[PDB]
């Protein structure tokens, strides 16, 4: 009975192998009080994790331990994993194998510290780290495809042909949904709405998840928003204030396709996918063009698949059939692939056991998870 | 067996922790004779405290030692506390912990002198100072709410969310029931009734407590009072003279909502409550709008809760549910919260002992009562 | 050609706007015979007003219609105003606008009855009521100052800054020259001089106007009067009896600064002026300290300005320049300000006309004279 | 002959291009009377602007039309600009180009309404809006530097490298000198000094400008203030009262470096400057570390440059030379840069003319001022 | 007075025939601004070439016009040649013959467009294109040898025996120093150092030039780097950050000998040199084994000659004397050979004149430069 934990930058997904949906999906935030507790007998913890930190947002500073796929606070990461094991899944980690997720081209100390914390703090019997895009390909039943994975920390593009990784063609951008949340925070001040705190950042993230979309033609959509008022929508703040947003619904996701509005020199996701395809051998590009898979929460914008199809079809040769696979459950696709991968009988010999960690230290994670 | 003393500007409330009502409620006045005693063998003290000063009003000058929450006469304060301990409660203060009350944003010398007098003159074994609004929240069983406390000296608005104080949003006005008594004294001269002495000030305070109320619509109430005579009431003076009052029943409490009739530049209590709510984080305002708590004697005007609800609902967004909590026993609510707070076992480690005062002086009251 | 009538408690001042002195100054007394007329053919009226009542004092009971600024006998007030219009000024009131005076914080029925009597009994074309202290500020050419006005009925302290009234800081004491006359009547019985009748009250008023003064240091003056006989003066009664007075020359005006010798709980005039200054905003106090204006007959005591300056300089901060303005013509200053105010062209639109009274009744005096 | 107007939240600076100092520096306040004018013939306007509102503080409510860099009252803004053009500069705005200032990340309606009021109410021939920090860089002769601008409304940090703006790295805090004035008002009540009105707010602003400073080590300065009395200073109030202040001289500016004492979740000015430097490209950080420019009145605290240098040198790598440029005339630096920018011949083609406004409306300000 | 221009992918070398060193060596980059110029009067070109683009790296996107020896942007190539002629050499190209360089097995349109731009844009009187490896053999005084030339775009291996080219044995790999820079960028993310921009690519190129070397035994060097810390070195970034690198010093140049770590199917430089020798006739191999010449910047790694000697001696028969010629000035060797070749009197009849270009078009470059 293995445990599958998709530990992304923004949201933690956790559950059991063999299941089809994550049992526990909760934000990976740690909240700490900014003020002094004055009423006694209440019961006031010094730390709040997950949905409890989200429900007490107005008196807490919220911190993400993971930034751009890299854990920057390991004590808060340990707190989040403890909340995963003991409060959400309600299991003992000493009797369950654990499969973790990681973004490609991460520092090696991240993998080593994850292995050390899993084997020493939680005393797991078995452990493995997988790349998220490979799990996204696992969930779709495919062995050939190019995966665009965009969550909250980073966006990575990984091509796989016939079950073989092509690590020279793996591309990675530091743009994901948190940068889109910050950009929407910046461009909402043009209408007079000020958001600066971490709780207001969570409010703007809710605004982006509810009302933002990807325009098929950006300049035509700007002309339509300038002409009429059919684009503007209303959102109710937690204090009852109603705000109205116009072109910011599609200007903020446009940073995914044109990162220069963030001051970034990198290319957009369509150009990155095309460059990853062109970095591969000429005999695999046809299968990659027809098997473009998207996973993650940032691929859940309305109209992102049609725009991605249009831009890649513009980039590709005219005889190539470009197909974008954006299933309705793609936001959990990485986890679903983990739930497939930990459930295979061929995978059962690829676990890192406690004996191998005892004889080799954390560095065995560089020899068993490749 | 702790002692709870709500030492407000106008009235002193005193009793034991674990009780539900104050054992001794009496005016905090010191009376001194204006004339010379001519009959010998009577027994004539040079000072009268409390109800004895109130029963001998016609030959005494009455002085309040506390003005706007700040003690201005410490010898008379010592006399009132001596009358509390030895004549009203009839206890020895050397064997009972004492919990005192204070308004927020008071001078630090007030707290220091209260600690010094409690530990040196009365030799208490333990001591604590609390903010009155926090005790008002204690009495209602709430840990989240915004407290409007108005007694005789000052009106303070304190928001608390999830047991956490928000001291940047605490607001304080120097308008309370004594200023309303003085305003009623001023506007009763329009009908030909002259009140200038301190005993006449106590008579006008009795008139305000018996016959004044808060109008729902002030201009409509003025039109109704100008049209008919159904608003006018009669009051009997101590010498048997019967006076009749009309619009002064609702013109005097209207200074609570429009302080400009007192020559004050501050806002009314509804605007102050709204400004304190808007000074807080956006994620706590919903719980503050539905948990507006009033305590004190100035909140015992008839119709003040309906008017407060109407004005705050006018100020708040239309989707916000404004609830005013005005319980029938709110005039003693601060004391009741003290009787709860001194009765908690978790509070028993937060007393300032005699050893800490001996090793640190009065300044320990700035480190233990926050 | 407007008429200016300063109708004080003790003395009536009357004349024309544009003049510098009142045309007719006479006591506001009504005298009635105590005995039966026995000689026929003389011509014996049932009522004597003014100087005729003063010249026939020994067979009349003298009554003041105004007590402490409030008219208590309106028929005698009508008699005095008739004597003003037809015997003193010798005009027709139906063709002259009339400007009247009133003390602040008077009953509203006094103003209403004054308006009704002026418009109905005397049929004036225009009418206005002013506060006396504002006219005292008008006479000195000042727009900023604090006026201490003390005549025969009441003493009022009114601060004005930059032409703006500060009605929350207006203070009023029921001590003036009539109470000083009664106190001098009481303390002259210690030397064996009995005065009980109204004519003897007028004699004692003459004694106070001729021989009383304000001591700079009261205890030093009492020591000087106890040591030598240089303070004692002689006064000749109307029957030729010569009386001698000592410390009563300065003990009777000392009730202005210490009202407790009258059995009054109020403060003295220096403390009342200081309390009125401290009731104002902190940015106007500097101009009020240097512009203290005195008007009225009770401010005509010798040495009252030096004593007022000394006590206010003791009360004020040491960096404040206290200036007392006591001009030699201040006893008529209110009237002089009326003669200025009714002579201004900007004031000519502020009269209450007969049409406004016909359409609104007496209550228009609460809407036009504020 | 262009006009340069630095229209900040607290103070309005105005003059001519080519000059080195602003011709007219005056507070941007509008004062309205709280009371009724009682003396006629004075001349009493319903509105007072600037120094006339400051000289009549005790009878006025003072309002700032700009809060945190955003105009909240446009009629009072029009009054202040009318006072600038016709009473201070004494010019006709119809023949002079006008260059205005704005804080970055302001609402677009502020710029649009400024353009509409300048072109329609005042009928200017030409118009431009600049960012204040770019003008601060203009005044120092620099084309590369990071500007910390803190006045009365907001604090903004803007980096510029080789004449190129970096708008993704522009940071903005809502903390400036008005919040410091309010914090000093709050912490002066601990010593028993009460300030609540707008005139008292101006008095506390004068106290902060005269006696407050930035401590190099805050805890060492608190220990020094607790040990001896060499830190305490005396201030004379307008009514002559002398108050004494101790650690509040350096506790109030400490909110610039630790905003959590205001209940704010933002970082201090040193951390904000460091975060703006780290938001830029790695090849420009060396020039930004050595060219940190401060401008505005809130940077005129004694010891703020040494403390800023110490904290940034603590934050920066040890091989980096941190240089803080705090010239003695930096309080006018924005205006001086405007006087440079409007005097350049290359700038003369960048004005928004009346023809462009007539053909395009206010929205042309989003196409010409970037 | 001919001009010799070695126009490689990364660096442009330029000077005069008869000299021993290039007069001007500068990077062949064109920089364009990513942001908008905000400060006027500076002087801001839209394009920066060479060292000016390198000194303004943080606000520019840098582009190489030559990729793998082939010009991909001819306008930027024209800009670089204009900067060579007019800013670096400071000559007129209309009076100087120009000798250019090219890699073998290039497209014919590259040579044709180079001839057309030289004769039409710059109006040169004479022109020639040479292969770089033949010039490397010219610089060493040799007429027999096999040249391994590796710069920034491509690596080519050209054997020449007795002055005769052997074009069937010329080999070409698309691996050179730019691919090594990209590989070092990829493997520096394992230590947590992120480099993605073009300026960061130039920084990583500086890191590779300063700290990278070729290991004699790769597995022994990996064991030594894993055992101790004597291999790790420190580098200071332009912002003052100090980074530490370990095995990446020799892992990145190992792609020259094992291209499979780049995802390339080609052989290493030692195997390519051996395969080029074995493609020749059996009677010339002895002279080629003893005359292996290296030129270019990628041959300037420390230890590349010893490793090349070891691997070729392993590949060659044991009786063959393998000699690697790696002179200290080999990075400029191509240019030096050009400076020899354009200085020979026998070469003076082999120029392509303007008359031949006018009568034949660009295609004459396929008949005169073989
Ligand atoms: N419907 C939606 N539309 C747009 N963005 C979304 C939506 N739902 C979630 N997101 C964004 O996806 C991000 C996290 O998704 P996820 O892939 O679970 O992150 P991670 O894998 O990094 O935990 C968040 O930044 C969130 O704002
Ligand atoms: N029924 C009432 N209606 C209006 N005011 C009241 C009533 N009862 C008491 N008060 C006023 O409340 C004030 C004191 O109440 P309390 O809260 O006990 O004062 P404190 O807390 O300052 O001692 C007095 O000024 C009194 O006039
Ligand atoms: N020279 C004086 N010294 C002291 N008191 C005086 C003098 N002259 C008049 N008075 C007193 O002033 C009072 C009346 O003065 P006035 O101001 O005219 O009164 P009102 O304004 O009330 O008519 C009388 O009581 C009189 O005794
Ligand atoms: N010497 C000083 N020390 C500290 N603060 C000052 C000083 N002089 C002015 N200030 C503060 O600077 C603020 C306004 O300065 P300024 O930069 O002109 O404001 P703005 O640019 O917003 O008009 C005011 O809040 C004032 O209190
Ligand atoms: N000392 C060195 N060690 C390793 N590589 C170097 C060194 N010096 C230069 N290079 C590399 O050589 C390449 C360019 O050299 P060069 O032969 O001048 O190129 P090209 O001939 O293509 O212009 C660059 O990629 C640079 O990184
Ligand atoms: Mg993820
Ligand atoms: Mg109370
Ligand atoms: Mg009078
Ligand atoms: Mg400014
Ligand atoms: Mg080369």
Swiss-Prot record, chains A, B, C, D, E:
The keyword Hydrolase applies. GO terms for cellular component: actin cortical patch; actin cytoskeleton; actin filament; actin filament bundle; cellular bud neck contractile ring; chromatin; Ino80 complex; NuA4 histone acetyltransferase complex. Changing residue 138 to F: In strain: CBS 1907. Its main location: cytoplasm. Its EC number is 3.6.4.-. GO terms for molecular function: ATP binding; ATP hydrolysis activity; identical protein binding; structural constituent of cytoskeleton. Coiled coil: none annotated. The keyword Nucleotide-binding applies. Actins are highly conserved proteins that are involved in various types of cell motility and are ubiquitously expressed in all eukaryotic cells. This is Actin. The record marks 68 as: Not methylated. Keywords: Acetylation, ATP-binding, Cytoplasm, Cytoskeleton, Hydrolase, Isopeptide bond, Nucleotide-binding, Ubl conjugation.
């Amino acid at each position: 009975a293995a445990l599958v934990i998709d530990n992304g930058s923004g949201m933690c997904k956790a559950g059991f192998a063999g299941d089809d949906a994550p049992r526990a999906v909760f934000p990976s935030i740690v909240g700490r009080p900014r003020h002094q507790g004055i009423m006694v007998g209440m019961g006031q913890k010094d730390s709040y994790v997950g949905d409890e930190a989200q429900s007490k947002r107005g008196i807490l500073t919220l911190r993400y331990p993971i930034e751009h796929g890299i854990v920057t606070n390991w004590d808060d990461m340990e707190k989040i994993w403890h909340h995963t094991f003991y409060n959400e899944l309600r299991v003992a980690p000493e009797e369950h194998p654990v499969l973790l997720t990681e973004a490609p081209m991460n520092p090696k100390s991240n993998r080593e510290k994850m292995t050390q914390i899993m084997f020493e703090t939680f005393n797991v019997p078995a452990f493995y780290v997988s790349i998220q895009a490979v799990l996204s390909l696992y969930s779709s039943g495919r062995t050939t495809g190019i995966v665009l994975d965009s969550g909250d920390g980073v966006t990575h593009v990984v091509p796989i042909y016939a079950g073989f990784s092509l690590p020279h063609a793996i591309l990675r951008i530091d743009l994901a949904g948190r940068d889109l949340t910050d950009y929407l925070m910046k461009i909402l001040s043009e209408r007079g709405y000020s958001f600066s705190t971490t709780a207001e950042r969570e409010i703007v993230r809710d605004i982006k998840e509810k009302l933002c979309y990807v325009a098929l033609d950006f300049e035509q959509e700007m002309q339509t928003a300038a002409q009429s008022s059919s684009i503007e929508k209303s959102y109710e703040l937690p204090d009852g204030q109603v705000i109205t947003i116009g072109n910011e619904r599609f200007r903020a996701p446009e940073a995914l396709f044109h990162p220069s509005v963030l001051g970034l020199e990198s290319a957009g996701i369509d150009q990155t996918t095309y460059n990853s395809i062109m970095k591969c051998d000429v005999d695999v590009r046809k299968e990659l063009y027809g098997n473009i898979v998207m996973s993650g929460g940032t691929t859940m914008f309305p109209g992102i698949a049609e725009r991605m199809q249009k831009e890649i079809t513009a980039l590709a040769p005219s005889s190539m059939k470009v197909k974008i696979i954006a299933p309705p459950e793609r936001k959990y696709s990485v986890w679903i692939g983990g739930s497939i991968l930990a459930s295979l009988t061929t995978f059962q010999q690829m676990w890192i056991s406690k004996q191998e960690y005892d004889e080799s230290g954390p560095s065995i994670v560089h020899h068993k998870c490749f």
